[PDB]
Amino acid sequence: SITENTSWNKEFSAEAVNGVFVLCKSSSKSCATNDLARASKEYLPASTFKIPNAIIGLETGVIKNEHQVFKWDGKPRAMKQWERDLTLRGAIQVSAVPVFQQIAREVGEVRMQKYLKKFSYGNQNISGGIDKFALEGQLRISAVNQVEFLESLYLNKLSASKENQLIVKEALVTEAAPEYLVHSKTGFSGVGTESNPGVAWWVGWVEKETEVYFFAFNMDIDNESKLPLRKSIPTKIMESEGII
Amino acid sequence: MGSITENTSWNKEFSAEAVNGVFVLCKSSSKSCATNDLARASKEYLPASTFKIPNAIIGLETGVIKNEHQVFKWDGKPRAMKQWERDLTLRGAIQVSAVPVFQQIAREVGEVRMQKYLKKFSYGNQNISGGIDKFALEGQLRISAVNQVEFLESLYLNKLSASKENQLIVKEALVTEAAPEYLVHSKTGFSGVGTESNPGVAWWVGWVEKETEVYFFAFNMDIDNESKLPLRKSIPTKIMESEGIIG
């Protein structure tokens, strides 16, 4: 069940953003959204794919453990912040694409397909090359599917050891307050065109008191200056919902 | 740890606030610790609420705590603090130092199992005399700052005599600050104000994961006035900031 909440529209209009926010209290059996249609529309995951990629990396033994350090070979990487040794949490938090490209290569297409089928992850379409299907290939996932996936992860219900799910959940912590804890991941496929915008994501969950809130935000983006809106729009909504 | 050195230049942070205390700070890769006071780094104090770290691990390990999603329900009876008068998660109970929640956990673990695990953990003087529900706050248990960092490093490495899963659960419950560069896991402790001539103790212990390095720390100080309590964070925070670790 997905219910439309019209009051959330104001955050989108004020910024002239075409986007969707899906928010679910307790569980994904009853989510709310600004846009029913877009809630289930499927977009490139981009770096939000680091969440299942990290779990799969761990499950297959490609990532040896929680403490593995991904060493930089000294060769140029697309962003300077990726040019350094990284922990799993570090590689996730700076969205170190080439670290995860190599994890994916080692996982391989057969195992990647299998796990995306186990995880019910989007259209499960990994075509486009093993090291780029989430960024420029055919893989698509909706805000609703993101939230279902994240809930399973939260409950340790994915087809993966509890251990590996905890390892990844810790790597996803992005805000700690006395009141609440935020686990989240951003994604950004690029700017595309005016006529064919890229997509920007912020997905995760918030634990406040004894409650949990699963969230997925996405927006069309054709200009990188608009990127911070992927956090300020959903944060504003959750602030006024009294969540963060 | 592999080594320890006294760095008396940190004393400035203690002097500024007229605080008698110790900071221990250890770099994981090099296994080396520094402290402002070698003598106090080895002195053993009441762990107070810092005992909620091992207690949480033991509660989980013995099955007393069911999983990381257990809600500790408030029965409705008045508690010593308003902030405890509510249902609490594991991280919740830990973060507001809900004594009654952890006293009940300890009662259910019991002395024999509690004694076993503190031996396994090499936790302090391993003395649980005083009552199963108050040894850590007003009984006979004592732990040094050096032992705190050893204990915490074992936890970080999932090397404690407990399942990886349970240590993982407690680690995430201990997260107190997340930045894109560093993650801080920590726990406070406060035994009381004691007296003028016999002060209480206040703690802040934890570790910081910065880039590919990890820093284990343990702070304690004498305290005879609750107004001084914030110093248990600001003093070691200032030291770690000046070391370039946090902030």
Curated annotation (Swiss-Prot), chain A:
Gene3D superfamilies from the UniProt entry: DD-peptidase/beta-lactamase superfamily
Q: How is its activity regulated?
A: Activated, with respect to most beta-lactam substrates, in the presence of 0.05 M sodium bicarbonate.
Q: What is the effect of changing residue 137 to D?
A: Increases resistance to ceftazidime about 15-fold in P.aeruginosa strains PA01 and PA14. Increases resistance to ceftazidime about 30-fold in P.aeruginosa strains PA01 and PA14
**Classification via PROSITE patterns:** BETA_LACTAMASE_D
Q: Which GO terms describe its cellular component?
A: periplasmic space; plasma membrane
Q: Which Pfam families match?
A: Transpeptidase
Superkingdom as given in the UniProt entry: Bacteria
Q: List the GO biological process terms.
A: antibiotic catabolic process; cell wall organization; response to antibiotic
**Carries keyword Acyltransferase?**
no
Any idea where this protein resides?
Answer: Periplasm
The protein's UniProt keywords, in alphabetical order, are:
Antibiotic resistance, Disulfide bond, Hydrolase, Periplasm, Plasmid, Signal, Transposable element
Annotated residues for binding of a beta-lactam? 95, 186, 188, 230
Q: List the GO molecular function terms.
A: beta-lactamase activity; penicillin binding
Q: Which residues carry this modification: N6-carboxylysine?
A: 50
> What is said about its interaction partners and assembly?
Dimer.
> Which protein family is it in?
Belongs to the class-D beta-lactamase family.
The molecule here is called: Beta-lactamase OXA-10
Q: Which organism is it from?
A: Pseudomonas aeruginosa
